[PDB]
Amino acid sequence: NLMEQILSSDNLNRAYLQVVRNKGAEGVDGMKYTELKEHLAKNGETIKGQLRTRKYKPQPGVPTVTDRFIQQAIAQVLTPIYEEQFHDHSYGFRPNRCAQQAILTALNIMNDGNDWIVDIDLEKFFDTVNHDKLMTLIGRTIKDGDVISIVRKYLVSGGNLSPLLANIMLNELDKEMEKRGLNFVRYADDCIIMVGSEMSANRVMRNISRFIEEKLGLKVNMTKSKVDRPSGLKYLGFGFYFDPRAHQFKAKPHAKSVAKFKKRMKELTCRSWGVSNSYKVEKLNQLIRGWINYFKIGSMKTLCKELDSRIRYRLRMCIWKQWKTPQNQEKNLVKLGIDRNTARRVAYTGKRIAYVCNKGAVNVAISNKRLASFGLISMLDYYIEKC
RNA sequence: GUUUGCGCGCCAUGGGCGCGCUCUAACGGGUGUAAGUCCCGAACAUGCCCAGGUAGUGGGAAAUGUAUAGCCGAACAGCAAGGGUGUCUACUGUGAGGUGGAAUCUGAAGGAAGCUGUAAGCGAAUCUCUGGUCCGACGGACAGAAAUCGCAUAUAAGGCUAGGCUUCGGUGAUAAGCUGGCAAAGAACAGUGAAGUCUAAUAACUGAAGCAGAGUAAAUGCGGCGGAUAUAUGGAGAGAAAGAGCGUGCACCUUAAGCGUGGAGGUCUCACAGAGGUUAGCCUAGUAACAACGAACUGUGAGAAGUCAGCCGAGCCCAUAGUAGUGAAGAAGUCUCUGUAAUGGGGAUGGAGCGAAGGGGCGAACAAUCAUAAUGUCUCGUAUUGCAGAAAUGACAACAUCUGCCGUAACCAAUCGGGUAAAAGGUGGUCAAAUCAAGCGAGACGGAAAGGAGUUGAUUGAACCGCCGUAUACGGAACCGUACGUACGGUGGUGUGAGAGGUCGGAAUUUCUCAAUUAAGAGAAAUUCUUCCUACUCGAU
Ligand SMILES: [Mg+2]
Ligand SMILES: [Mg+2]
Ligand SMILES: [Mg+2]
Ligand SMILES: [Mg+2]
Ligand SMILES: [Mg+2]
Ligand SMILES: [Mg+2]
Ligand SMILES: [Mg+2]
Ligand SMILES: [Mg+2]
Ligand SMILES: [Mg+2]
Ligand SMILES: [Mg+2]
Ligand SMILES: [Mg+2]
Ligand SMILES: [Mg+2]
Ligand SMILES: [Mg+2]
Ligand SMILES: [N+]
């Protein structure tokens, strides 16, 4: 009787609105989402009748758009009550639960202080999930067989049902962990399992690997699942370092994240690019606001300030490259506020001279007040304003 | 749309080939028939070293200058004919315009074959060895192409820039080159420096190799192989060898800003003749051109400024023009040798031709895009088959599970020797199934319709980045350039920059009309896009 809760007008138009805010790729059908609106406006009774009578035949590298609308409706009807069923320490794919408070909870329980962290990974998770056991757990939760029927025929056949199915299969494991009394966090697929003793770390490793391999039907790789120290194993782009005050085990962005940050930065502000530097300033601003809104809790202030110095040196180097003509280089430099002959010698020197750019009168030619007049915000200020 | 950039002609102050004299190693001597060629000698000044934080004397090792006849002139200065101004001004014309000046800018990398004077540099047949460099196209180095070989090469080789760290911390001089954190190349300065050769002398006083990174790219790097090498490339050895200036000759050969001349096509001005409307009187423009508003259009005649940028483009068309030119020192054409990738070059006949400039058109071709007898399957039966739920009873109290301990160590933290399934230990019986069983299915079996594995039309190809070869020049030998330097022949890449004016064409949309003024339908003025045009204004080469 729950497909009779599915096929209700507010649920359908909310699912439709969510799919058109997704703006997903069309793919094999190649069918555009406003025409998805038109096609559902002409096929609503047909699709709803097929849902009632279970003769729907959905078909997939990119899913079909009407199938995406059906996914969104199924997820919208299935997340409530399940959220009460799901473990409260599982922070994936729900409203009001993200990875940042997952790392915050992890910080709380390493303030409790479990030593060796078991990074449990499950390679090819959708391959290891059995359809029958997942449907069995769904049938144990919801008794009406029509939704079980459509989810089953869909599973034999981004996606908005894969979060719920992953959360179901992981949440049974989370309930078993709470049955053990063990402490652990997981976002979506990656599990950090926290234990204070290396012998107990290997014991919990063996227990969990055997429990995953037989009862759940899933498989855990022996590559990622090493019982290692927190400084050597990362969780969602975050590394953990030791505050040398004994009470905290503090967080930082893992160096691969900052490597990606630096790489995208340097590939965005190449001074051989032909685009105006206001556009590059705005793109830089987009990346920094996203990067703070993700990595707020983990500290890299001693690293991000060196990166700030790199930011302003790179901007001054880019502006010097974009001026590109020695005569107007001299003219713009003397407009900047330096004397004529120093501008002359610097302008004839201006070919190459990366060394004069990183330190010299070139670095004084564009300063912090001038780049604040340009309008780009610093990383440190976006820290001190952020909660 | 980047000062110049077109055709034809003349002229070397350019080069070559013959001739003539004369000069040549500081100054001097030898040597030998013969020295410009081979040998020998002095002084001063500089570099380098004795300073040992210094620096004036005082001395020494290589090297260099004074010091070949002579060359060539800096990214050096001064001059400078010319060229520009969208800057002022005097004159001249009815007018398009012309001319002369003041204020400047330029006077360049391709002919005032610009002038004068410098710094630095150079500076002698040929042979041999060697270092360095450059080249053997372009194309991230494929394809294509006449156009080396093998690897490597972008989340980035390899070259650099500044630090951390492992190990060692008097000999020099010379001097092509290499690098100074990257498009490429050059100058200057700085720091190093290959092959060798020469030298390894004298008494003092007042930092280099290797390992990991962090940076740093408009891409090449490394190793052969062939070749080139007069910025007279760095040197080493043979070599009684040739170099330099000046004059001069040729039926010798060339030059983009010099000199003379030629300008189509298209734009503008003016006076005549025909239309036009203004009220026999006026005007015939303004808008960059196109379109449009418009009376504002057209054949004449008189002029004026004026060209000249490969990009798909053979050839035909217009006009200067079959003219300027060129051609009897000898044209077109024919015949016979010959080269290249292609363009080309001789020779013999032959006895009059041959034959320009810029701008628009049309346009073949080339290129791109677009047109041109199984499986299988839907529907019932038929019993299996995939996972869950309490478990009479049977077997076993042995399996799941959370908690990191030993000592030793002067106090363990292998922080010292064990052990990571080290110990002490909590919690929960653990299961094979009599038994039955929602829901979703998934397969498997028959009966049930059939079916089965070359060519041409059209549209676009705006503009650019180059590269190679012969010829011809310059900055700066190579390299990098000078519009790809330019001409001709070869050859790959990128693909439609802004603003403004149009075309407001086509569609959506604001407003109207139509389909009944009803569709998310169609159309008309115009908003956006799109299509197309425009150097008109900017930007790019
Ligand atoms: Mg070449
Ligand atoms: Mg080359
Ligand atoms: Mg190349
Ligand atoms: Mg490397
Ligand atoms: Mg020499
Ligand atoms: Mg004239
Ligand atoms: Mg073209
Ligand atoms: Mg063309
Ligand atoms: Mg030169
Ligand atoms: Mg070259
Ligand atoms: Mg070149
Ligand atoms: Mg070039
Ligand atoms: Mg160019
Ligand atoms: N030009």
Residue numbers in the entry: 5 to 64, 81 to 177, 195 to 424
Excerpt from the paper describing this PDB structure:
Unlike their larger IIA and IIB counterparts, group IIC introns are almost completely dependent on their IEPs to facilitate intron excision through lariat formation, thereby forming the functional RNP that serves as the minimal element for retrotransposition.
The maturase does not change its orientation in the absence of DNA, remaining coordinated at two anchor points along the D4a arm, with the thumb and DBD inserted into the active site to participate in catalysis. In this configuration, the binding interface for the target DNA is maintained, enabling the RNP to readily recognize an incoming DNA target and rapidly engage in retrotransposition. In previous ligand-free intron structures, EBS nucleotides were found to be disordered or rearranged. These findings reinforce the mechanistic role of the protein as a stabilizing catalytic component. Further evidence of a pre-formed catalytic core includes the persistence of the heteronuclear metal ion cluster, which remains organized around the lariat, although M2 is not visible in this case.
